[PDB]
Design an enzyme around this catalytic site. Structure first.
Site, PDB file in Angstrom:
ATOM      1  CG  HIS A  57      -2.420  -0.229   0.649  1.00 13.58           C
ATOM      2  ND1 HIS A  57      -3.055   1.375   1.124  1.00 13.58           N
ATOM      3  CD2 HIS A  57      -3.207  -0.768   0.627  1.00 13.58           C
ATOM      4  CE1 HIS A  57      -3.760   1.797   0.515  1.00 13.58           C
ATOM      5  NE2 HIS A  57      -4.378   0.472   0.238  1.00 13.58           N
ATOM      6  CD  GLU A  59      -1.894   4.168   3.308  1.00 17.22           C
ATOM      7  OE1 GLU A  59      -1.481   3.811   1.856  1.00 17.22           O
ATOM      8  OE2 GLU A  59      -2.486   4.289   3.346  1.00 17.22           O
ATOM      9  CB  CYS A  88      -3.621   3.448   8.086  1.00 19.40           C
ATOM     10  SG  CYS A  88      -1.941   3.475   7.946  1.00 19.40           S
ATOM     11  CB  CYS A  93      -1.566  -0.310   7.053  1.00 15.89           C
ATOM     12  SG  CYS A  93      -1.130   2.046   6.473  1.00 15.89           S
TER      13      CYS A  93
END
Ligand code: CL
Length: 183
Positions: A57, A59, A88, A93
């Site tokens: 992802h 992030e 998130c 995450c």
């Protein structure tokens, strides 16, 4: 901000209409400011945008490129995320970003989000987890949308043109997020 974002790409994914829920992608524009002698030092090689790639992802893809920033652990850097989805949103995450902040105490993370995903469940808990790890999370207003358009988008000198309901969407999203992180 070496490579600029496609302008049509920016409006589609940063649109903050609550009634539209696209799971296509998540974009993260980033900038790192060093805080020194009453100002903020910003380097163009510390600016740009990411999206989700492979199974990593956005992030977490920013955390990966942190060593290549060659940051000085003896000074204070403020990192800003302008993100087009709930921060998130992916599983696990918030735990990695939480661990990252605990290791790199010289970093202040500021998250400006186009919207949030209030599930009254794990996505809402991820927003509170970031707050408790030190992150400063808030909803993007017209200011943040216009700043990204000027800073990260291939606009060719065109001004930012807001979409319908941008302010109404933003304030309602802001009200819900504040209630979540209130203490
Ligand atoms: Cl807010």
């Amino acid at each position: 901000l070496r490579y600029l974002m496609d302008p049509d790409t920016f409006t589609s994914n940063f649109n903050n209409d609550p009634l539209v829920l696209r799971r296509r992608q998540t974009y993260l524009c980033y900038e790192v400011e060093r805080l020194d002698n009453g100002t903020s030092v910003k380097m163009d090689q510390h600016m740009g945008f990411l999206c989700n790639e492979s199974g990593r992802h956005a992030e977490l893809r920013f955390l990966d490129l942190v060593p290549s920033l060659q940051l000085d652990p003896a000074q204070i850097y403020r990192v800003t995320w302008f993100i087009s989805w709930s921060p998130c949103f992916s599983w696990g995450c918030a735990g990695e970003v939480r661990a990252f902040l605990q290791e790199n105490t010289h970093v202040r993370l500021r998250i400006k989000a186009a919207r949030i995903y209030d599930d009254q469940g794990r996505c809402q808990e991820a927003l509170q987890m970031l707050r408790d790890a030190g992150a400063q999370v808030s909803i993007m207003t017209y200011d943040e949308f216009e700043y990204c358009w000027d800073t990260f988008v291939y606009r060719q000198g065109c001004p930012f043109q807001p979409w319908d309901g941008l302010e109404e969407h933003s304030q309602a999203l802001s009200g819900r997020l504040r209630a979540i992180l209130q203490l």
